[PDB]
Design a protein around this ligand. Sequence first.
Ligand SMILES: O=P(O)(O)OC[C@H]1O[C@H](OP(=O)(O)OP(=O)(O)O)[C@H](O)[C@@H]1O
Ligand SMILES: O=P(O)(O)OC[C@H]1O[C@H](OP(=O)(O)OP(=O)(O)O)[C@H](O)[C@@H]1O
Ligand SMILES: [Hg+2]
Ligand SMILES: [Hg+2]
Ligand SMILES: [Mn+2]
Ligand SMILES: [Mn+2]
Ligand SMILES: [Mn+2]
Ligand SMILES: [Mn+2]
Lengths: 328, 330
Amino acid sequence: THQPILEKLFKSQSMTQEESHQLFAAIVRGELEDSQLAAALISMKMRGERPEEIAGAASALLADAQPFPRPDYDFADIVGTGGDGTNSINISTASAFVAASCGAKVAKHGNRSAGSCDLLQAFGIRLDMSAEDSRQALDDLNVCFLFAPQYHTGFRHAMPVRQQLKTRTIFNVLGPLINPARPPKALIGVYSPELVLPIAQALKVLGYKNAAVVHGGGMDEVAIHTPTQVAELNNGEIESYQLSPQDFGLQSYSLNALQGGTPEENRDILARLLQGKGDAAHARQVAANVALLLKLFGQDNLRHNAQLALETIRSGTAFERVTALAAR
Amino acid sequence: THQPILEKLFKSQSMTQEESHQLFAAIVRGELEDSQLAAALISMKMRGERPEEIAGAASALLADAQPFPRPDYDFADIVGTGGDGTNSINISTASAFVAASCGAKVAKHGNRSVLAGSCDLLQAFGIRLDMSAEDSRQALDDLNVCFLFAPQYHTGFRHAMPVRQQLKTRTIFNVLGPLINPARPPKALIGVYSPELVLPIAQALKVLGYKNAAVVHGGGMDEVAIHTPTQVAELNNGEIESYQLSPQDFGLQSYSLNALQGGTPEENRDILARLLQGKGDAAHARQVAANVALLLKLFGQDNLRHNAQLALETIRSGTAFERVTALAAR
Ligand SMILES: O=P(O)(O)OC[C@H]1O[C@H](OP(=O)(O)OP(=O)(O)O)[C@H](O)[C@@H]1O
Ligand SMILES: O=P(O)(O)OC[C@H]1O[C@H](OP(=O)(O)OP(=O)(O)O)[C@H](O)[C@@H]1O
Ligand SMILES: [Hg+2]
Ligand SMILES: [Hg+2]
Ligand SMILES: [Mn+2]
Ligand SMILES: [Mn+2]
Ligand SMILES: [Mn+2]
Ligand SMILES: [Mn+2]
């Protein structure tokens, strides 16, 4: 029992990485009451979560998470906090398939909201695949999907309070920092510009090799309808800069061009897209995100990266990868 | 749905008395989930509850309080937030019967918290905690005193006890108890567990429209003390004045906090018996004399030395215990 930590929080005092690790270890184990878990989440919220706190929390959740045979070769994650406000299509999910077809190995983590992960079901992709096969799919197809629920069983002890609270808390940012395959590289999108730098520093503490945290025009990704604020981690060194669609040799578009629809529609969108028959704005936003991710693998010419991602798309070869995966 | 108010709280913004009233008017009817109530309580805790918010919340609780036929003559309450970690004898309860024995009408409101409490004492004396409002009002008319037990008049005060004990930390609820007397008295001697709550609580009382009141804290006790100076905030004719009083201001010897200490409920019951009968410890009598003395100030009696002297003669007289038995006889 950690009463001692809670009073520290109630005094607008931040926890140490270890104190936060304890608190969140007890949380995913259901050791806390609804009221306590809520007081913890709200006290941290009002004060403003610190990088060491976010790292300690994530560090805890991963410890509880189910095992995954982590490979040696380089692979990464392309995931975002979501809830950006601007109803858009599933950029990250599409980018994972295009990236896997553009050289990179992507092990994506994430769970159903409509929304995301639901259209993966629609493509006939068993969300509860075994850690054994996902590792296999990753080696053979350069991509796999790790559904949070089966890896973070304890995450359910926090859902009720989160829902009833209907407000943003540290759990919104801990979603992307807990891939059970512990990837060394990652493209992480955040719903707010103020989150870009904090997360970056969190990933550093978590010891990530190469990573990028993005936000632009309200999107928790790389934007085509406006500049994207970036915080890149490399060699334990962080750099801040901003990118525009012309930096990928792409033409700036409009957010509206990237607007979601419904289960059936969106399935068609991503299908007819990965098949190389979608809109131009859709192909652009994706290639832009894949282009920045490829920079985490050492490919520094964003324009060439974008051109390749775009041709890989138009190739249709990506969709043949949701099918190869849908058979296991 | 009060989601708009909860989102405002999470941004370190204060609610208006109206908003506060709405939010707590929902809390007492068990309409909020444990998570939401706890979030609401912690967010106000961390920021610091304002006078206007304390009033809104109290107004809400009083709205759902069972009725009580409020007399037109002057009467008062004498209660504190408790929880001062002092372990002293029951000052306010004793001061309640002594004040009545010399002419002051006292309709004391008592909260629950545990035996080990003022109501547990009166219960030990044989007093009916579930006496009807009519009977407590009839006792106030003839005996100058009566006890209004919280659980009997504030049925919604319970929908918060589970969360309150789980959180194991102070919240706005610790200070609402003393402000929700169901008879809505025009005068009151309220004690608080910390010096910084004196002014805010007196400011809330004014907002709630109290005529004459005094909020105090003295060397750790939520009562007027004689072992050290007492922090006071007095409301009179619509204005609040701040000052401290000292034992000497009452003409009383200054005894230690330790000499006021109590024990088991049984010790506490007999201690209060001997005291009220005019056979207790000097420390005990003196500490009560000081609280009754300030109380009478709310009744236009401005000389504290005289007030304290009257309280002492009232105590050695033994009538205060007489009124105890009489209250029990009903
Ligand atoms: O609150 P909402 O607006 O519904 O968004 C929240 C979701 O968005 C993110 O998807 P991810 O980062 O995996 O990107 P995707 O859209 O490409 O799946 C995240 O994984 C959530 O599932
Ligand atoms: O149990 P605690 O942690 O101390 O907190 C609650 C206390 O508040 C009440 O005091 P009251 O106003 O009735 O005055 P009295 O106790 O001096 O009679 C009650 O009698 C308890 O003493
Ligand atoms: Hg490529
Ligand atoms: Hg009197
Ligand atoms: Mn995304
Ligand atoms: Mn997104
Ligand atoms: Mn008291
Ligand atoms: Mn007391």
